[PDB]
Write a protein that binds this ligand. Structure first.
Ligand code: HEM
Ligand code: HEM
Ligand code: HEM
Ligand code: HEM
Lengths: 141, 145, 141, 145
């Protein structure tokens, strides 16, 4: 659970993203693949080339789940239960990777929302992505 | 480290970086986002709120100092373990900063560079800078073993 | 987050510890200071040499905090509040240190309760200590 | 990397370690306590229960090799890097295991040693082992940084 101030900042921030959420989620993925090549290990079935329609598509789905997590900020464990089980039980994603994806997201957000990415918003978003990470790796920690 | 093409891209980009500003913003954000880090800077006076930290004079000054070390490591990109040897022992043996924090500051710097350059901070240019940041963090940490 | 099976293993193991709690709290601390010297910087006012009355006393306090958490496993946030304020707001303890104390505790327990220290118990205890760590870490995420 | 008397204290205690038993317990416990480590052993068969993992022949057999690798490192306590250079290429460039996991396995081994040896695994003796563990973890990780 985030503080009411934090929840306020996340919602304000995601509002400015608006109809760009899928473009930003796909970019966050490209940046994660380039900066941290080990993550590619989880998508051997994907075409990872710059501009891949697979990467674009998946980025839309990633952004969709973040939007749903935002509209359900007071019950993250409940809203992402199916996703929790996919990542923790069937995919066995190492927790380290969630920090890399969270970081790539913050860099993407920071470059598209210069004035909105204030220190307080930054801290609020970091806590949020950390809460989401914590939820997705629950079948285990 | 880095290939020669990477080194050239990184070097040219750095030319536009206002280290006096970026540095202050990076350290301030590190102190706001990861609160425990303030334990090492209680001497800077007031850090109780995001704005007290960001507008704190010693924070902006020390930030400039941290960034200058970076510019200096950028001119010795092949001998990072050597350039930061003294700085490593200071932080490790005299200051007692956990190495994990070197990675956190490194990442905050990348986010700050991204907020200040927007479009120009491309996914490929960021990949290159992540390499440098990792290298610098590892050089600062070698005195823990 | 702790499952019912976990809550069951943690309660079972702590019941075995019993009156040895204070002692194990002292041993865990001694192991931590010896294994990870950096943690000593948080205790400049303690004599950290072997057998110091300050380490015993303090281990007894740490063991008491944990017993309390074991009795209030469903409401860790409510039970450890005061301590969260202390470790996060006041002391500013780097969250890496909590991993180091948890490891020391697990090591201490393993050497005094070998028959009881089974793989499943080790796993639940590990989750309990991480959940406790996350709470004392609450004032920052 | 440690003094010569510590090195002797460690090597002396390593003599009483049954690598067949301890090795399989440690790898097994690694797989149980940190379940994400199982995706690397999906070919070892059934790892659905703590009982399945602990009783798995491939786990017991593989755990022994890891400790032999550990016994090998005991004998090369200075150039830990050169010893594990062949394994570093295996884990880093081939399997793509995150470095954080070498630390977890080393920590799980310390817990396993404590369980098997009781009070003989004193605080001061554990401290030395904690140094060889980070050493092995760091060497295993050098092909990544
Ligand atoms: C911010 C955290 C993350 C969110 C919100 C998220 C969300 C998603 C979503 C929405 C899906 C599609 C699920 C479905 O179709 O039902 C998915 C699948 C998947 N995720 Fe994540 N994810 C996250 C982190 C990670 C991390 C850190 C990795 C590892 C690098 C990863 C690896 C995968 C893989 C391999 C798949 C399956 C791809 C496929 O076969 O279609 N995810 N994720
Ligand atoms: C990863 C990048 C880092 C670099 C390149 C760096 C560099 C430096 C430099 C050059 C100084 C000396 C400045 C001077 O001569 O006045 C310094 C001092 C210091 N640094 Fe760092 N540092 C880094 C990370 C950290 C981190 C993460 C912390 C811990 C929160 C930290 C805490 C300190 C402290 C307390 C001092 C002494 C302050 C003083 O003398 O007034 N540093 N650092
Ligand atoms: C599961 C983890 C921990 C528990 C349950 C715990 C518990 C406690 C308790 C019960 C107290 C005494 C509070 C009082 O009566 O005033 C305390 C104090 C303290 N703790 Fe922790 N603690 C934990 C982790 C840590 C770690 C990882 C550090 C740093 C290495 C730490 C550093 C301190 C310090 C410096 C004090 C004040 C000591 C004094 O002034 O006497 N604690 N802790
Ligand atoms: C830090 C201690 C470690 C040591 C000393 C160690 C030692 C070894 C050794 C001796 C081999 C056999 C190589 C051969 O002869 O072909 C090996 C293989 C392997 N290790 Fe490790 N290892 C360590 C940590 C890890 C970790 C943490 C993971 C992953 C979570 C891991 C995953 C593997 C896998 C998948 C194999 C190959 C098994 C196979 O043949 O299918 N190791 N390791």
């Amino acid at each position: 659970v985030l503080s009411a101030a934090d929840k306020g900042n996340v919602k304000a921030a995601w509002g400015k993203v608006g109809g760009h959420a899928a473009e930003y989620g796909a970019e966050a993925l490209e940046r994660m693949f380039l900066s941290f090549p080990t993550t590619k290990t989880y998508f051997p079935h994907f075409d990872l080339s710059h501009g891949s329609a697979q990467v674009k598509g998946h980025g839309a789905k990633v952004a969709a789940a973040l939007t749903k997590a935002v509209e359900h900020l007071d019950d993250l464990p409940g809203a992402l239960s199916e996703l929790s089980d996919l990542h923790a039980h069937k995919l066995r994603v190492d927790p380290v990777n969630f920090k890399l994806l969270s970081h790539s997201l913050l860099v993407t957000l920071a470059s598209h929302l210069p004035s909105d990415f204030t220190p307080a918003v930054h801290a609020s978003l970091d806590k949020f992505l950390a809460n989401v990470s914590t939820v997705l790796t629950s079948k285990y920690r | 480290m880095l290939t020669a093409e990477e080194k050239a891209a990184v070097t040219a980009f750095w030319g536009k970086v206002k280290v006096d500003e970026v540095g202050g913003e990076a350290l301030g954000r590190l102190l706001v986002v990861y609160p425990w880090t303030q334990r090492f800077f209680e001497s800077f006076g007031d850090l109780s709120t995001a704005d007290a930290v960001m507008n704190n004079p010693k924070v902006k000054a020390h930030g400039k100092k941290v960034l200058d070390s970076f510019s200096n490591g950028m001119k010795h990109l092949d001998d990072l373990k050597g350039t930061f040897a003294a700085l490593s022992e200071l932080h490790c043996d005299k200051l007692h900063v956990d190495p994990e924090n070197f990675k956190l500051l490194g990442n905050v710097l990348v986010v700050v560079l991204a907020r200040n350059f927007g479009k120009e901070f491309t996914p490929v240019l960021q990949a290159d800078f992540q390499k440098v940041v990792a290298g610098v963090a590892n050089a600062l940490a070698h005195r823990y073993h």
